[PDB]
Design a protein around this ligand. Structure first.
Ligand SMILES: NS(=O)(=O)c1ccc(Nc2cc(NC3CCCCC3)nc3ncnn23)cc1
Length: 292
């Protein structure tokens, strides 16, 4: 910790405060994350993450385990997708830039998923951008290390907006499909400039999904009626057209989004298969208009 000068609070993450900081010796600019107090399994899990290197994954530079305290040192990025989306709202992020960001996030997911590491808590706040037109996933793997809480250390409510239905229905065993669901939610949000499912409680989240995608049943999702928090008494809404859900997304994008939002996690498209979807045929890498 004391090898680092704090520059500014960037905010409060799921686990603790996050600071922009400078390495007092080398002068590296980093994101310094203090983790709420560790358990030996967390230590070993976190150490696995240090090897999990990819250009679309925010690089974990160091784990500092001293003073019976936990600090993670990450590559610093200057802006998140929430801020960029807010700043891009009058016109929306251009479609070629949305496609580039999606394509790159799918490459980051395909990499981590191939090593059997899930994120489990994707959201615009942990998708980070640079001036070179890259986008990167932050906090990959931390959920398995530390366990997603209802509120943060400072009592902020953790979003349910990107949570997959199998989590909301109480499944204990998450697959990589939960990441594809979240990213599909984020895809829809970039295109429409509104969150797809802005739930404010678990049942509101579920019922918003149900109203857009149809109440899931045994036809679309074998095994659904036997999940822990499924209730026979759930209302039965009908599905709406994607044409109505994500205008003005084109037929390729609407097709891909449908596959990312399949109820059954076993039918949901994988990151690798999604990279091959015709939506990405004409993918490019534009430079974003970034004000820092
Ligand atoms: N709000 S902002 O666009 O100015 C912004 C967003 C992210 C960062 N950087 C950042 C932020 C971050 N965590 C965010 C979690 C949600 C609260 C804000 C900090 N983790 C990071 N890892 C590497 N960089 N980095 C800096 C500015």
């Amino acid at each position: 910790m004391e090898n680092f000068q704090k520059v500014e609070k960037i905010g409060e993450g799921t686990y603790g405060v996050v600071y922009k900081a400078r390495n007092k010796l080398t002068g590296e600019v980093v994101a310094l994350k203090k983790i709420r107090l560790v358990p030996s399994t967390a230590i070993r899990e976190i150490s696995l993450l240090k090897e999990l290197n990819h250009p679309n994954i925010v690089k974990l530079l160091d784990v500092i385990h001293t003073e019976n305290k936990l600090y993670l040192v990450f590559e610093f990025l200057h802006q998140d997708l929430k801020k960029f989306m807010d700043a891009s709202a009058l016109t929306g992020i251009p479609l070629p830039l949305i496609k580039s960001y999606l394509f790159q996030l799918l490459q980051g997911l395909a990499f981590c998923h191939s090593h059997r590491v899930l994120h489990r808590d994707l959201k615009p706040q942990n998708l980070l951008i640079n001036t070179e037109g890259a986008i990167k996933l932050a906090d990959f793997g931390l959920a398995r290390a530390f366990g997603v809480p209802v509120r943060t250390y400072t009592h902020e409510v953790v979003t349910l907006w990107y949570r997959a239905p199998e989590i909301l229905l109480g499944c204990k065993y998450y697959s990589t499909a939960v990441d594809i669901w979240s990213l599909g939610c984020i895809f829809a949000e970039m295109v429409t400039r509104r969150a797809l499912f802005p739930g404010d409680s678990e049942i509101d989240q579920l019922f918003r999904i149900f109203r857009t995608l149809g109440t899931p049943d045994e036809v679309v999702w074998p095994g659904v009626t036997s999940m822990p928090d499924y209730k026979p008494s759930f209302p039965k809404w009908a599905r709406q057209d994607f044409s109505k859900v994500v205008p003005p997304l084109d037929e390729d994008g609407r097709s891909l989004l449908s596959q990312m939002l399949h109820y059954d996690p076993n039918k949901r498209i994988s990151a690798k298969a999604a990279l091959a979807h015709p939506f990405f045929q004409d993918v490019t890498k534009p430079v974003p208009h970034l004000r820092l």
